[model samples]
Target: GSSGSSGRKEDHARLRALNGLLYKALTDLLCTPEVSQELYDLNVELSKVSLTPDFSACRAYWKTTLSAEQNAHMEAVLQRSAAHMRHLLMSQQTLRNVPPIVFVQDKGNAALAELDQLLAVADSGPSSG
Candidate 1:
């Protein structure tokens, strides 16, 4: 029994499990109504963080498994999500100039666009992100 190979296999499983839980939590948060640019902004700021909740037992299982097509689709999903969020934030800034009551009324189209983008992303499935 090679200790090195066996240890790496265990580490891979552990890493996948840890990353899976993180994805679930992330998806749950994205499902909430408050999802917005601030979410992306804060995520961007904190993403460089390399804190390990459990040492080497953490990895993204999909990194090695993704096919080129799946990878491209995921890339498209990310690009669209980022664009949608930016548009929504800009629309928000525009809405702020109007009276508070008309906020929703003023951005109906923008809201629907976001909804469409979200639906597409959701249809792509969680791993698409």
Candidate 2:
């Protein structure tokens, strides 16, 4: 029971850190008309995939189940961000407001190269040569 509690505490800490990073990124992106690379970097850094298969089983439970106040705060953030994105989606008025698409234009090419490499290796993989 002690080990389980310790693990939950760690998960809670990481979750708070990630939430702060997300809110900071949002504020950085929205607080100015002209943009800074630091803002973009923070965004990219926060977009990382967490939770390996080894993430403790209770993680989903803790993440989805929050205190009433926390849920209200998250819901408000969600509504504001959604409205902002809807505005951006409908107009070209703000140049930097473009959606943070995962891989667009040139960055998408990296996946193509990876796919080709995988195909080549798979074709040669009856035996590792």
Candidate 3:
């Protein structure tokens, strides 16, 4: 009758669309002067954006080459601004529901590098007969 398709394919498509929309909105918000000056100064860039299965919450992963202390401070700032960010997303009038977002540090690349270094050291060690 209608074009109401309920399948995993549709679900994944919607999820990707949501991710893109949220990412763009979030990136713009971060670049604005209204938010934290330090965030802008740090040039924080989002690495990836993901949502819960039920669309109840959002996780925004950001990457930075700064130290742990700086990352911690940045996370604090993002947490404090989370509510405002959600409100901004709501104002976009794009989605029926806007979920609360959590800022997470993306250490994927760093972890990989660490693993590679460890493997290299192990390979260079003396081998048994």
Candidate 4:
């Protein structure tokens, strides 16, 4: 709870609204074809964003098991899209400031897929003669 430092109603409202905007943008891009197929090839690429209440710094994470080329391309795409995303938020959100966006990667997707393969093998029906 940010109820310290003499928090006010306006602060809470602004924080909530900012979080909502960040979540929307993050989820939209992450779930879009641009990310799923074009970027990660349907891999478990995921993004989480943390935007300061002032909307100054936005830290975004992009999780995946991408190849080196994929990684480079993804980074380039993300960097190029920052301005577009900023415009997107500014137009869609009712706020005075929009935070800067960043992108990151996580390797959870590979681990999950490997685990699934192992589980499927282990679950093979008992002695299929």
Candidate 5:
């Protein structure tokens, strides 16, 4: 009753491949490359693109400095363009099922800002105080 490491890594690699494809497509449709870079500069990190165990749905958890309004706009654009996204992935991908995409806005930036401020204050240095 044991599994090999190769199996897990291979599974992860497939998921990462799908993640990259979706990430680039979403960025192209919903954001300028500059905007994407700025968002990344703001401590916005994508944890992963998670597909359902059956690969029927995908959720991208995105963290960015864009305000709630901006994130909403981005999400709206993504939803509007999801079909086109599906088309891109479909034509290029060999997967059995193309999962529906869900975008989740991660609030890590706000938390990280607060944490940085706290650390600066504790150090008694130039703080965001």
Candidate 6:
């Protein structure tokens, strides 16, 4: 009844390892002087890294509480440095194929805030209003 289950498990493990490696690399790169001063000042935190099924590309989710304009500017800066970052990773020889990275803003806190609002409304009870 179970086929390729073991293969899937291996895939999950590999993905997790890759994610951790990418996260660490990005964090170090962001803090280093090689990157733009603006990016360094932003102090962006990479919350998660996800690779496509074929490992063709990487989606790096970052979190920061900057204003909307600042966030947009940050993303642009990240996009500009993506190729250089990939090259740095490649030079490390850790991965055979370093996929192109796409920076994405993580909305984890926003989602949590929305959930809290819903819970608060539910707890207030309809009779109170």
* Deviation in Å, model 4, residue 1 alpha carbon: 19
Worst 10 residues of 2 by lDDT: 56-65
List clashing residue pairs in candidate 1: none
TM-score of 3: 0.70
Highest lDDT model number: 3
Write the residue-wise lDDT of candidate 5 on 83-105 in tens digits.
65676667655554567887666
* Tens-digit per-residue lDDT, 56-123, candidate 2: 32111112113556444543443344445334433534232223322112112233343434443434
When summed lDDT is taken over every stretch of 10 residues in candidate 3, the lowest stretch is 111-120
Which tens-of-lDDT digit does each residue in 1-129 have in candidate 6? 223434667676656767777888888888886665667777776777867766677888888555777777888887897888877777667555677888877653363343434443435546865
TM-score of 5: 0.49
Top-scoring candidate (TM-score) = 3
lDDT of 1 by residue, 6-35 (tens): 355666664455444444433444444476
Tell me the whole-model lDDT of each prediction, alpha carbons only: 0.35, 0.35, 0.76, 0.61, 0.59, 0.72
Model 5, runs deviating above 4 Å: 1-17, 24-47, 108-129
Q: Which residue pairs in candidate 5 collide? A: none
Off by over 4 Å in 2: 1-6, 36-129
Candidate with the larger lDDT of 3 and 4: 3
Which lDDT value does model 5 have at 20? 77
1-129: candidate 4 lDDT, tens digit per residue: 222463677877776777777777656765666533444343434456565555467666766444867667777776676666677667664676777777655542444343434443445567879
TM-scores, all candidates, are: 0.25, 0.24, 0.70, 0.56, 0.49, 0.68
lDDT of 2 at 79: 36
The runs of at least 3 residues in candidate 4 whose Cα sits more than 4 Å from the true structure, single-residue gaps closed, are 1-6, 29-45, 66-69, 106-129
Misplaced by over 4 Å in model 3 are 1-9, 108-129
Q: Which ranges in model 1 have alpha carbons more than 4 Å from their true place?
A: 1-9, 34-37, 40-129
Candidate 4, which ten residues in sequence have the lowest lDDT sum? 108-117
